[PDB]
Amino acid sequence: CTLIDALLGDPHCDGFQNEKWDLFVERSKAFSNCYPYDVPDYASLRSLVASSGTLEFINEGFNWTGVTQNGGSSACKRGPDSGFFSRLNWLYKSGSTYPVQNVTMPNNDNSDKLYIWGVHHPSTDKEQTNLYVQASGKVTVSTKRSQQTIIPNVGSRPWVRGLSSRISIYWTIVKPGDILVINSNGNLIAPRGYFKMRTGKSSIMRSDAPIGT
């Protein structure tokens, strides 16, 4: 497992749930077994998580309305059956509609919350509509002082683990007193909760050196 896959919850990484480290060691033999994805500014996400030094995850119910939750795929197989990143919730249509999605998560706690979310890029327009109804999806994740709007883009990408489609991963940090707001007319890969952020001596290293006592 790479640190990011452990973060996201790729099934073969599920051992790493809620783990802690001073030093996370990434091996060269690591590989991704789940829905093919990418992280814009991968380096930064990797850094800030490595530095936080904990994967501790705290669940939160978001009030989603009139959409199916827990979408999954055969590209990401958990056990015998189809699956998906454990920390992400794939939302899609209920029947003939994907109601615009507008939700809030205040941070009333003592520390910072790290939210990992995503946008789905379908391969064909058919795939877009079969999932989200509307031909053009969109996701805006915001706080009081900052915002991100991602527009998903339909098109083909190299075949990977079965799919020509992709997921783009994004993150939002919410300080205490701030509020998270998620707004989507579809294509949203929703967070299931937050990762606790810590400061300290933690970091990450790439090495093939055996660990020893």
């Epitope: 999954g72 795929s73 029947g95 003939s96 058919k126």
Partner: antibody, heavy 118, light 108 residues
Framework: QVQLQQSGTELKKPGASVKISCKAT????????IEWIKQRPGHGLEWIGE????????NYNENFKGKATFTANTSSNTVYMQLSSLTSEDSAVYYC???????????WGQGTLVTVSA | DIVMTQSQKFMSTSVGDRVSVTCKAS??????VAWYQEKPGQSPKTLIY???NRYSGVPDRFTGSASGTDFTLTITNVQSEDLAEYFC?????????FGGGTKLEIKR
Amino acid sequence: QVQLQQSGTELKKPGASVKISCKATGYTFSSYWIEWIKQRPGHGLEWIGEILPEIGMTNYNENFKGKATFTANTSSNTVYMQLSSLTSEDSAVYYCARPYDYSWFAYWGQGTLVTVSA
Amino acid sequence: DIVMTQSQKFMSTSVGDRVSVTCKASQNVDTNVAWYQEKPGQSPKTLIYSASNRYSGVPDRFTGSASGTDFTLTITNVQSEDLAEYFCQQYNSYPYTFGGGTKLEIKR
């Protein structure tokens, strides 16, 4: 012309399992959900669930969770439904259907009869 | 779940006459409702969608209507080939639900 070809009739002892196939022809296979519907002689029409073939996303009726499992072979353009732990309650005619595009049903299969008894 | 109630298990009509099947959703489905015709021994066939709309190849005799949660399939000039069972479906939200079915019966 769009055609959904289901598999032959089936007879199965209680407690066994069965895999019914739906073979889609005459349209791009990956562009449409495949739906499964159950019909018992006194219960009318129950919706089992749907599967979107490319990405293998399965959506089940809460009532069938654990009874029914959809899969898709994208090379053979075929959708399979598997029924497990069969009881007499599962004796019915099973249809597979394709939406016009994303919602209401346009094309139906010819049906597969499944009978369960010792 | 949403219940689609077709209260008429059997309808009586005569050829050339007019007949209406009712279906009542138990909560708002908007206008997303379809009507299907199942003849004996054949597979279901599609009649109506969006509650008012004629699917291609369907005779002008069949017309759907909707008022609120009330949906009605009306056949004018019933023919003999119209002997069948009629199902309504709400495709509005999951799970998709169906009506009990209404068997059309003829008097000659």
